[PDB]
Amino acid sequence: TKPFSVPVLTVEEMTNSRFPIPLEKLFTGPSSAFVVQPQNGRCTTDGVLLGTTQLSPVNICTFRGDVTHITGSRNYTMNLASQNWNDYDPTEEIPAPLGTPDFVGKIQGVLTQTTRTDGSTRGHKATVYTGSADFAPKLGRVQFETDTDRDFEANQNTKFTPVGVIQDGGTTHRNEPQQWVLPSYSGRNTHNVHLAPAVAPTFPGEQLLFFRSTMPGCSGYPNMDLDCLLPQEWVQYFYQEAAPAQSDVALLRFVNPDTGRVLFECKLHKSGYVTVAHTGQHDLVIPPNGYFRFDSWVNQFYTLAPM
Amino acid sequence: TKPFSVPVLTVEEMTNSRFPIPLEKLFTGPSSAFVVQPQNGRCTTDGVLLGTTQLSPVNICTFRGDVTHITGSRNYTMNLASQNWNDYDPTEEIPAPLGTPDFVGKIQGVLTQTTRTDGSTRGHKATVYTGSADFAPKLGRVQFETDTDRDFEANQNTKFTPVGVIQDGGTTHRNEPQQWVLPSYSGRNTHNVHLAPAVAPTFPGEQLLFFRSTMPGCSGYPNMDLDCLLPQEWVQYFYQEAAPAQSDVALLRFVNPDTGRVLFECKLHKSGYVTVAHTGQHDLVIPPNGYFRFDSWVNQFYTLAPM
């Protein structure tokens, strides 16, 4: 069998799989009081992309299509195209277009457009509320709130580049975004379909290990924590390698390459998430040059050394 | 050193701990995709009541106090008293008054009242929407919708007796109640406090075992499934016995007394919930005289025989 492995990359060398920003740190905490079912950053260890996951980190939380002005307002409806500008097909066996945001919140960015006949261009501040009834990316429809009521042409290529998140600042700080609440991809009162499954630790004393970033904040007092289950580079690497899983669990050691010292060990479950032996909320303290090393296939009953 | 046990009672001889109706059956299913954090039917095996749990089966989802008419409506605000008509104290270390509903839904029942001076009485159809901003039992205020704007008197003892649940038949069938969504006990935009913890299986191949009833439906197409973690009789029994836990897990066998044969075994975790070894949704088929029997103290690493 082709040997399994994970990339030789430090945490800071890698990228969040749920928003186009670098990873910052490792975090673990209990999760029984919320549902951990992100759709980006989902990949089996033998390289099957799940949920809404696609390969490039720069397409995460972007949208492409043409826009229609909602007269009387500064709002525009975008009819979604595929990343390569091809027609988008709502009947594919996915929850939503690949790269669609997988949390409820207010994502701020910039809508840009080029007019093809003369090469004229324009960019405007834009916000997408993924909790809105007009957020229906699975059916190809997303509404943006912008700072213009006139600049954007119809039937011209238009792109949303995400920047960060905002919070209604007259409200209790850090109550949005809600990173563990999936959007309703087809709008109100419509069940999501074809989801990657929710994940949870399934061994005594274990917690999920999260790959954490801080999203930029553009207004108010947002909760900028963003946790993904797999670095985007691991998604990319498993897809490329396609090494078959020999058991349910790949045992990884986090090692300091200067000293060879193992700092902690963790379980990489073959369906694509990581657990550690710890109880409580904890920001891991790691050497900046540390990296993950696959050591052995184990079963689900392996007892990790406490971290 | 007092020996632990569970009562010798069949499933149909016991009572749901989350609504005043008998238990009907046993059910198991995966639970990573929702939060299992009920506040009624919560009790440790050594008899410590948790959440909003109290001992009386008939006080579950009941409210008592005086009512104030909401001028212009057929609605009344009940100013809550304790279940024994004493003053209610919002500063106790509980999430809400004991027996408060622990799910978001529309509970229909009857508001009754007696006039102290002459013994005149009155009763009216009433509904409490536990997802309402005006559902704030932690602060002693609960709004009822009734069919009168003038019959109830001020400063007179008033009781809500629950009957069942309703759904808006003009909307998708079985979309409410939501038995795994806690109310906001202090109203809009206010965090719940002092909750009994969420629960989850913590061993490979295990699922929660649920004690299931069917709530009466009073209108529309409600989801009447109601799952509790412990029968109300087990809450009552553990409270009375107060037997100390000798380990984290009491191993129970479900035995058929007609044959003496064990049908399945399960783990009763000392913090007060049950797991079984099974994968998938399953309605347990059990003999009518079967009951649970405590056999030995084990730990969270014990491998159960497949259910």
Epitope: E93, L139, R141, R188, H191, V193 | H173, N175
Partner: nanobody, 116 residues
Framework: QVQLQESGGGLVQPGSSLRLSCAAS????????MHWVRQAPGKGPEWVSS????????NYATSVKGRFSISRDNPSKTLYLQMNSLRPEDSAVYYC?????????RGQGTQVTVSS
């Protein structure tokens, strides 16, 4: 079991209008997005139209936008496609399809020929 049954196809002149129906059973219908897809002779199936549970979100293939209208009646669990200004290239078998959890379901279809 989930069941979908289309109806209303036939042979019609270019420029005319035609309404297709799809009767659904075996699931709540409400709560689920529904779609129309079509398969022309010698080609694979292609998306035509989509609608969410309440009907407040709809979308259409570029080739039928402005001419087709999708709608639904959830109490009777019926999906509809109103087709106007029909063209020869609209000729195809039309299917209703849905997705529930991680499985897709499609009806047997109804034939529509647009020809003089």
């Amino acid at each position: 079991q989930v069941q979908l049954q289309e109806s209303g196809g036939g042979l019609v002149q270019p420029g005319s209008s035609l309404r297709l129906s799809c009767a659904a059973s075996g699931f709540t219908f409400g709560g689920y997005a529904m779609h129309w897809v079509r398969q022309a002779p010698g080609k694979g199936p292609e998306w035509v139209s989509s609608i969410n549970s309440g009907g407040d979100i709809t979308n259409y293939a570029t080739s039928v936008k402005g001419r087709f209208s999708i709608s639904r009646d959830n109490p009777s669990k019926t999906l509809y496609l109103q087709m106007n200004s029909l063209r020869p290239e609209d000729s195809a078998v039309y299917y209703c399809k849905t997705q529930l959890a991680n499985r897709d379901y499609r009806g047997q279809g109804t034939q529509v020929t647009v020809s003089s």
